[PDB]
């Protein structure tokens, strides 16, 4: 199959290998207590956390002294989060490879160097969110992504992960974000292209898809993110990247064709845009 090299980054179960909507693909112990931890190897472009029971942004620093704080790192001296791209590179000026590393990888590694709650030898590494409008790297103290159930969130934190135009310039980063994600991770939606399966030397349509109405490319990406692999309901729950991570958006018919099988070839249809749950909800190439 000639598309093997090209379509490799769309084998999300391999390049990413963890939940997308909720990323809790690994476990780690901090001070003797085991906690769940984001482990996806690819950045989740456009993903953010919405706090529905408070007027607080999830990148606000956690409270220190509750509902008035967010999911971000507590203030520190010297300050570690939030740190701009320029601040990060001068903070690691001595290291050679920080010059090479890009914004997202540097932000992920900067968060990984934060010692979790004075546990020098803990596997835990805080996840990070990078803003490309402010060029700020936000280290997330709270690695949780969703707590929204009728048990105690029908009437009030209560929060959910989602794609939003507000989160347009955000990139959710786990500790395992690879430094070569530009080549092995999906970021941009493919214009005039449609995912398909390569069978018997031909690129055919995805055999079975779920068709949902979608008014634009952004909504189709939001739908795909909602139905994508997650490591939380609503090791048994760990998706390992298995899920409805791909969608073919038909612009003319305003349909969002979502499927749970890794695509292996592309089809040229000028009315279609190929999107993945990890892809940026707006950018195109």
């Amino acid at each position, epitope marked *: 199959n000639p598309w093997t090299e090209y379509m490799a980054k769309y084998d999300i179960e391999e390049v990413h290998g963890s939940g997308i909507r909720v990323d809790l693909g690994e476990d780690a112990e901090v001070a003797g207590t085991q906690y769940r931890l984001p482990s996806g190897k690819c950045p989740v472009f456009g993903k953010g956390i*919405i706090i529905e029971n408070s*007027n607080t942004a999830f990148l606000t620093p956690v409270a220190t002294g509750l509902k008035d704080g967010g999911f971000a790192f507590p203030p520190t001296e010297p300050l570690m989060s939030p740190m701009t791209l320029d601040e990060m590179r001068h903070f690691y000026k001595d290291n050679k490879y920080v010059k090479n590393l890009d914004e997202l990888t540097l932000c992920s590694r900067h968060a990984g160097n934060m010692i979790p709650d004075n546990d020098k030898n803990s596997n835990y590494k805080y996840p990070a969110v990078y803003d490309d409008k402010d060029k700020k790297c936000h280290i997330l103290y709270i690695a949780a992504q969703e707590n929204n159930g009728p048990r105690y969130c029908n009437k009030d934190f209560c929060f959910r992960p989602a794609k*939003d*135009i*507000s989160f347009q310039n955000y990139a959710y980063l786990s500790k395992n974000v690879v430094d070569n994600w530009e080549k092995v991770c999906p970021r941009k939606n493919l214009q005039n292209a449609k995912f398909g399966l390569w069978v018997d030397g031909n690129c055919e349509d995805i055999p079975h898809v779920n068709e949902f*109405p*979608a*008014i634009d490319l952004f909504e189709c990406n939001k739908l795909v993110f909602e139905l994508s692999a997650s490591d939380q309901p609503k090791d048994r729950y760990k998706s390992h990247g298995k899920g409805y991570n791909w969608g073919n958006y038909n612009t003319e018919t*305003q349909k969002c064709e979502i499927f749970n099988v890794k695509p292996t070839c592309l089809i040229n249809n000028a009315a279609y845009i190929a999107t993945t749950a990890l892809s940026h909800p707006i950018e195109v190439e």
Partner: antibody, heavy 121, light 109 residues
């Protein structure tokens, strides 16, 4: 049962700023899109702009970027800030809520009573 | 913007008659994003149908919407006094969302 109510001035001078507020009570502002609709006597209904509780807003280009929409989650009140007003802006302004979050449910199933605003010297 | 044109502008129908309202669009409209509204004097519009056929909550089955592409019609099966009002069509496929100029349905007596 969600009740939407508009509040604002009845008279605004030309070139002034028209500020209107929509007090959302009886239901959440989350997962819903909040609109400002205007019907001028002589024309039909006109759409002004949107706002989601995340902060995202879309406006009508016909208004030439004059309308600014904001939302206060703590007070659950949606505001309209229309600048450089003109007598042609004289009309009845409603705030309407979409049936849901997803695009097919963007029909307006919840409406306020509407408040009349006159623009004149 | 997408232009919606309704016809006829006025109707005088006795109770029990059938009213047919038509709405034409300047460009094709997906069925999922078409709606009809009812407005009484001194009151805000009330949603009747969305997605071109789905009757809103509490709306009697006398109201029925249909159409495809650039043609859409609203039918009121057996008019009764509480139905007579002004009716508007709306599209929400492409911003700006637009309405028709409306149809006034008078009660013939």
């Amino acid at each position: 049962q969600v009740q939407l109510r508009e509040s604002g001035p009845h008279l605004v001078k030309p070139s002034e700023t028209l500020s209107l507020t929509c007090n959302v009570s009886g239901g959440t502002i989350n997962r819903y899109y909040w609109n400002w609709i205007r019907q001028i006597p002589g024309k039909g209904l006109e759409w002004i702009g949107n706002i989601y509780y995340t902060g995202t807003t879309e406006t009508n280009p016909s208004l030439e970027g004059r309308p600014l929409i904001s939302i206060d989650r703590t007070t659950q009140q949606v505001s309209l800030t229309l600048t450089s007003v003109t007598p042609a802006d004289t009309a009845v302004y409603y705030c309407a809520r979409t049936r849901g979050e997803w695009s097919p449910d963007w029909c307006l199933d919840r409406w306020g009573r509407g408040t009349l605003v006159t623009v004149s010297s | 913007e997408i232009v919606l044109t309704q016809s006829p502008d006025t109707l005088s129908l006795s109770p029990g008659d059938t009213a047919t309202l038509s709405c034409r669009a300047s460009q094709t409209i997906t069925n999922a994003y078409f709606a009809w509204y009812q407005q009484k004097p001194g009151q805000a519009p009330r949603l009747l149908i969305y997605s071109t056929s789905t009757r809103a909550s509490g709306i009697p089955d006398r109201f029925s919407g249909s159409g495809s592409g650039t043609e859409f019609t609203l039918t009121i099966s057996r008019l009764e006094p509480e139905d007579f009002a002004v009716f508007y069509c709306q599209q929400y496929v492409r911003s700006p969302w637009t309405f028709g100029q409306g149809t006034k349905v008078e009660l013939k007596r």
